[PDB]
Amino acid sequence: GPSFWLGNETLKVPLALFALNRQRLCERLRKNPAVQAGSIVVLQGGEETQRYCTDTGVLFRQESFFHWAFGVTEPGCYGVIDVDTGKSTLFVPRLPASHATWMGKIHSKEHFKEKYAVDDVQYVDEIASVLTSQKPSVLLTLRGVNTDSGSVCREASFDGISKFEVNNTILHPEIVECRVFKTDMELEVLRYTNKISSEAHREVMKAVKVGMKEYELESLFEHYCYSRGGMRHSSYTCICGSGENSAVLHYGHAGAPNDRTIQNGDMCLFDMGGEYYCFASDITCSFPANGKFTADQKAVYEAVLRSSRAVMGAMKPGVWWPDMHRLADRIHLEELAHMGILSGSVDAMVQAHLGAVFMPHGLGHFLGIDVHDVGGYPEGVERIDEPGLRSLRTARHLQPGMVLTVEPGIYFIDHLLDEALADPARASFLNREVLQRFRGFGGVRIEEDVVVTDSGIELLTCVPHTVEEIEACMAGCDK
Amino acid sequence: GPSFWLGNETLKVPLALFALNRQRLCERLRKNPAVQAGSIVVLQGGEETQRYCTDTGVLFRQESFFHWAFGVTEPGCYGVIDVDTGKSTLFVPRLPASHATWMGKIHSKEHFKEKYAVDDVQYVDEIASVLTSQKPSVLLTLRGVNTDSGSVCREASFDGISKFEVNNTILHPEIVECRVFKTDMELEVLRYTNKISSEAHREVMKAVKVGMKEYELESLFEHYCYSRGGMRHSSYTCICGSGENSAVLHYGHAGAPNDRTIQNGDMCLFDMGGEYYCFASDITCSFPANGKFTADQKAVYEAVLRSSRAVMGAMKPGVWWPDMHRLADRIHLEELAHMGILSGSVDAMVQAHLGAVFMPHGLGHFLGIDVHDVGGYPEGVERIDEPGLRSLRTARHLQPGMVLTVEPGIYFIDHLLDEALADPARASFLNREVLQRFRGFGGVRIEEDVVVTDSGIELLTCVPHTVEEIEACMAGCDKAFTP
Ligand SMILES: [Mn+2]
Ligand SMILES: [Mn+2]
Ligand SMILES: [Mn+2]
Ligand SMILES: [Mn+2]
């Protein structure tokens, strides 16, 4: 069948990928005791937007649920699925013949059916009539709470929908659960997005020079991903933190727009991931700006490399993800004690939650069409109310087909360090004379993307992540 | 005073630029007979957004009016200006100390006062109290209709605003009019945005190779503008049309995303413009994919170059912009007849609106903080209901300080050509025997940005736009080389 493709060496993504998702959703919905016969899933795609009140067009990126079901790149569409048969109907906007002048060629409905391999194509202005003809019991629309944003999903609406019986509770948890488990076709896309972004990270590491602005590497990374990978979008705003900014978790946004000059002796923490056809990648490389780890930098780096490798080696079906976060905490504390920053019983440090002083974020998260992918906290899965652990984006047990980031880090964040130093329960573990040397160190994060298999994980990321690989890469060495 | 700056070779933009805008707005409002004493301008900045229902953050770009007045890059702010004194107060979000964990240093209000050179800085949640203490007569908020989008500007609102007298009619036309006329400090930025985008266009022309995807040049252009110009944004989505796509005026959107392979013999029409500190640039370069104009390509290009040169030579204060559009139409029709594509009386062709078949868009538009800048159709300036002219984004007379695109073009759009061939009023002018040769030709546009001066225009753009410069550039000649 047909495939999405941007030419050159970019990946061909079969449109069958989305037909399988539609089928998987129907199978799950048929098992749901509350789903009536003759139900129709109704999803609304994203619409074209502009900057505020201007006519400056914003580059359109499809809504993630709609993309998962249909893979449609055009704005203004709807898509419905007959639950009982799996029959898919795409609704495209009716463009007046006069629009050839400005937007391009006016494609027939037949063109879109062939392009997307759906069962039928109708015009958006006919959606009520078309749906009325099928005499559905109820329309299943999308409404739920994204557990990372707190936002409520946009439920489909169209002119005349009030004449139908609409259920907006059943769909969200089912289609979320389908997204948690990636098909082999989806994994192929995630292998590709990791390949391109890994190559881009390698190019950025080769190019970093003392005296450059952080954003020079952001530009380079995105240029590689687009020109070489066909990735017009990034999965998230590039985080190009150097020096003290490598300790700033929320760095690179408009308020801190990657505008610092890289200085000799700085650590760099570059967290960047290209997006291909609305599929994410999420990779972090930390390294010395001048290509040579100091002893202090090497010690901090290898502590995170130890926890990274320990987590990946332990991951397999049945593992509780919060246990992996605790494993990384314990290893960080062991290594920070070895370094002399900490002293005392590591068991006692764990009881005091000292790990979270150095890694306040979650160990990792589901990844997919969204970089922080859906389904981390379905009903019955509770958030853990402890420092560090409460920031985990899922408290689920691992299962095959899940895709997770593994991104332990250690950071020296003055606000957390000072709070711990004022707490007698934690101050005792800290050796100020050594810690002072690491004030302003910044931080180290090592992030990989992995798939849970039947027996362990598959590593998708391929970047230089050992000290030897990093220093060799940055000195212009081959291989 | 302080300056916005992204290091390296990027432009230092004094924050005094925005102080001047605030002062100019206050002077205009003080002259306004309907503005009450003790009035306060209240603008609401843009807020942080995400993709749909996800937590995927969208890179924040400031709202244009708010940027014009204050130059603030942070989301979540408000800004007020006391009309009578000019006193400026920036309101910034109150971040709880616990956000350092993720945010680093949480900047003090003093930091923002020094950063932006405003008279006072307060927290957003105190705006109601702060304004109550100043005992304003009226709050002047922003509401009006953008004449390019049809959208209504977002009026400032905050909890407690109903306790104040609010006027939402006076401000919009005044602040729009202030934006129409660019200050010397603003021109320095628009000169810079044109400089960077011109260099990027040159790099793209040097790098274009038959067999590349259009988007490879889009990526290259944006990479140059950001890495070398500090332009994190483009002024608009890049239009990288090759072959038949050069005839597609709004090409490159998600539905047609610059994904065609450039083939030998194609014309390329690349309309790309970097944005620096929310200031626009807007440039189009047309050129042969293989670096050598054919006779047909050369003829069409020079026809558009003739109309561009004539318009720029004629532009000066007092000139009616629609007259410039008609001038370009007439020159296009004359040259297309000289080519053999058209035959007959050009006077007859003009009366028939034949120009619009070949240039269906407007000749050019105001440019500024927005690429299609505000103020083209203030009250009492009417859109002209004719082909081509109805697409003009202003029907105003030129005055010094205005910034305009000059972007004539000729395109071979089958839809329009066939319409003309089915119209007895127009069909006779077309010579199919020659016209057939130009079906699928694509199109040529030559777009530059200019400033209206006291007596004419200043050229902001510096790209290869003659046939000789273009072939020279694509053959790797240096920018200094004079062909
Ligand atoms: Mn990341
Ligand atoms: Mn991540
Ligand atoms: Mn343009
Ligand atoms: Mn333009």
In whole angstroms, what separates CA B284 from the centre of its chain?
12
Chain A CB contacts of B152 below 8 Å: 53
Q: Is B271 one of the annotated binding-site residues?
A: yes
Q: In terms of C-beta density within 10 A (0-12 exposed, 13-18 middle, 19 or more buried), how is residue A300 classed?
A: buried
Q: Which of A144, A149, A221, A203 is nearest to A175 (CA)?
A: A144
Q: What is the domain count for chain A?
A: 2
> What is the DSSP-derived secondary structure letter of residue A36?
P
In whole angstroms, what separates CA A11 from the centre of its chain?
19
Q: Which pair of structure tokens corresponds to residue B479? A: 């920018």
Chain A CB contacts of B251 below 8 Å: 103-104
Spacing, Cα A466 to ligand 2 middle (Å): 19
The gap between the terminal CA atoms of chain B, to the nearest Å, is: 43
Q: Which pair of structure tokens corresponds to residue A293? A: 């780890």
Distance CA B376, CA B392 (A): 9
Residues 6+ apart with CB under 8 A from A345: none
Gap from B356 CA to chain A (nearest CA, Å): 11
In whole angstroms, what separates CA A104 from the centre of its chain?
33
Residues 6+ apart with CB under 8 A from A66: A43, A44, A45, A46, A72, A77, A79
Helix (H) or strand (E) holding A353: none
Do the Cβ atoms of B231 and B196 come closer than 8 Å? yes
Q: With left for phi above 0 and alpha for psi between -120 and 50, is residue B205 left, alpha or beta?
A: alpha
| Last-in-domain residue among A134, A162, A180 | A180
Q: Is the dihedral of CA A159, A163, A168, A170 positive or negative?
A: negative
Percentages helix, strand, coil for chain B (3-state, rounded to 5) are 40, 15, 45
Distance CA B153, CA B145 (A): 6
Distance CA B326, CA B355 (A): 8
Beta bridge partners of B271: B239, B284
Beta bridge partners of A166: A139
**Ligand positioned closest to the Cα atom of A361:** 2
Q: Which pair of structure tokens corresponds to residue A276? A: 């291909």
Q: Which pair of structure tokens corresponds to residue A397? A: 């047990």
Q: How many CB atoms lie within 10 A of CB A288?
A: 21
Q: Are residues A174 and A251 in the same domain?
A: no
Distance CA B288, CA B470 (A): 9
| Last-in-domain residue among A180, A212, A228 | A180
Strand intervals (E) in B98-138: 120-123
Q: Are residues A285 and A160 in the same domain?
A: no
Q: Which of A230, A61, A225 is nearest to B213 (CA)?
A: A230
Q: In terms of C-beta density within 10 A (0-12 exposed, 13-18 middle, 19 or more buried), how is residue B400 classed?
A: middle
Q: Which of A29, A27, A30, A71 is nearest to A174 (CA)?
A: A29
Q: Are residues B169 and B229 in the same domain?
A: no
Do the Cβ atoms of A175 and B53 come closer than 8 Å? no
Q: Going by DSSP bridges, is the β-strand pair B139-140/B40-44 parallel, antiparallel, or unpaired?
A: parallel
Spacing, Cα A284 to ligand 1 middle (Å): 6
Percentages helix, strand, coil for chain A (3-state, rounded to 5) are 40, 15, 45
Residues 6+ apart with CB under 8 A from A164: A131, A136, A138, A139
Q: In terms of C-beta density within 10 A (0-12 exposed, 13-18 middle, 19 or more buried), how is residue A387 classed?
A: middle
Do the Cβ atoms of B127 and B159 come closer than 8 Å? no
Q: Is A373 one of the annotated binding-site residues?
A: no
Q: Which of B367, B357, B209 is nearest to B284 (CA)?
A: B367
Q: Which of B7, B20, B101, B140 is nearest to B68 (CA)?
A: B20
Q: With left for phi above 0 and alpha for psi between -120 and 50, is residue A359 left, alpha or beta?
A: beta
Distance CA A40, CA A60 (A): 27
Distance CA A57, CA B354 (A): 30
Q: Going by DSSP bridges, is the β-strand pair B88-92/B120-123 parallel, antiparallel, or unpaired?
A: parallel
Q: Which of A461, A478, A474, A469 is nearest to A199 (CA)?
A: A461
Q: What is the dihedral of CA A173, A176, A181, A187, to 10 degrees?
A: 170
| Last-in-domain residue among B123, B150, B180 | B180
Q: Are residues A175 and A196 in the same domain?
A: no
Helix (H) or strand (E) holding A274: strand A274-275
Q: Return the residue in B66, B101, B216 with the most chain A beta carbons within 10 A, the one to mutate for interface testing.
A: B101
> What is the DSSP-derived secondary structure letter of residue A35?
P
Spacing, Cα A447 to ligand 2 middle (Å): 7
The domain in which residue B401 lies consists of 181-483
**Beta carbons of B255 and A75 less than 8 Å apart:** yes
Strand intervals (E) in B419-472: 443-445, 448-452, 457-459
Do the Cβ atoms of A403 and A367 come closer than 8 Å? yes
Q: Which of B440, B441, B439, B458 is nearest to B450 (CA)?
A: B458
Q: Are residues A197 and A275 in the same domain?
A: yes
**Beta carbons of B415 and A97 less than 8 Å apart:** yes
Q: Are residues B408 and B261 in the same domain?
A: yes
Q: Is the dihedral of CA B417, B423, B428, B433 positive or negative?
A: positive
| CATH (domain of B394) | 3.90.230.10
Helix (H) or strand (E) holding A405: strand A403-406
Experimental method: X-ray
Spacing, Cα B307 to ligand 4 middle (Å): 16
Q: Going by DSSP bridges, is the β-strand pair B49-50/A403-406 parallel, antiparallel, or unpaired?
A: unpaired
Do the Cβ atoms of B92 and A240 come closer than 8 Å? no
| CATH (domain of A152) | 3.40.350.10
Give the DSSP per-residue string, B330-377: HHHHHHHHHTTSB-S-HHHHHHTTTHHHH--S-S--B-SSSSS-S-SS
Q: Are residues B225 and B185 in the same domain?
A: yes
Tally C-beta pairs within 8 A across A and B: 202
Give CA separation, A28 vs A65, A96, A173, A179, in Å: 16, 39, 10, 12
Q: In terms of C-beta density within 10 A (0-12 exposed, 13-18 middle, 19 or more buried), how is residue B441 classed?
A: buried
Gap from B455 CA to chain A (nearest CA, Å): 31
Q: In terms of C-beta density within 10 A (0-12 exposed, 13-18 middle, 19 or more buried), how is residue A451 classed?
A: buried
Q: Which pair of structure tokens corresponds to residue B215? A: 């988007």
> If you count them, how many residues does chain B have?
483
Q: Are residues B137 and B239 in the same domain?
A: no
Distance CA B76, CA B391 (A): 36
Distance CA A191, CA A182 (A): 12
Q: Are residues B174 and B191 in the same domain?
A: no
Q: Are residues A120 and A199 in the same domain?
A: no
Distance CA B247, CA B360 (A): 11
Do the Cβ atoms of A234 and A214 come closer than 8 Å? no
Do the Cβ atoms of A296 and A303 come closer than 8 Å? no
Q: Which residue has the tokens 């400089």?
A: B195
Q: Going by DSSP bridges, is the β-strand pair B448-452/B457-459 parallel, antiparallel, or unpaired?
A: antiparallel
Distance CA A245, CA A443 (A): 8
Kindly report the backbone phi and psi dihedral angles of residue B429, in degrees, each rounded to the nearest multiple of 5, phi listed first.
Answer: -70, -15
Q: How many CB atoms lie within 10 A of CB A380?
A: 5
Specify the resolution in Å: 2.0
**Cα angle, residue B118 at apex, residues B112 and B123 outer, rounded to 5°:** 50
Distance CA B118, CA B110 (A): 10
Q: Are residues A161 and A235 in the same domain?
A: no
Give CA separation, B85 vs B26, B29, B31, in Å: 8, 12, 14
Distance CA B431, CA B421 (A): 10
Give CA separation, A130 vs A191, B210, B253, in Å: 39, 46, 29
Distance CA A445, CA A282 (A): 12
Q: Are residues B375 and B286 in the same domain?
A: yes
- Specify the 3-state DSSP secondary structure of B76: coil
Chain A CB contacts of B57 below 8 Å: 236-237, 253
Kindly report the backbone phi and psi dihedral angles of residue A366, in degrees, each rounded to the nearest multiple of 5, phi listed first.
Answer: -55, 145
Buried b (16+ CB within 10 A) or exposed e, A116-130: bbbeebbebeebeee
Give the distance between the most distant pair of CA atoms in chain B. Answer: 78
Kindly report the backbone phi and psi dihedral angles of residue A81, in degrees, each rounded to the nearest multiple of 5, phi listed first.
Answer: -130, 120
**Cα angle, residue A42 at apex, residues A36 and A46 outer, rounded to 5°:** 160
Q: Which of A360, A346, A417 is nearest to A389 (CA)?
A: A360
Beta bridge partners of A449: A405
Taking each helix axis from N to C end, the angle separating A295-314 and A467-474, rounded to the nearest 10 degrees, works out to 120
Do the Cβ atoms of A304 and A445 come closer than 8 Å? yes
**Ligand positioned closest to the Cα atom of A240:** 1
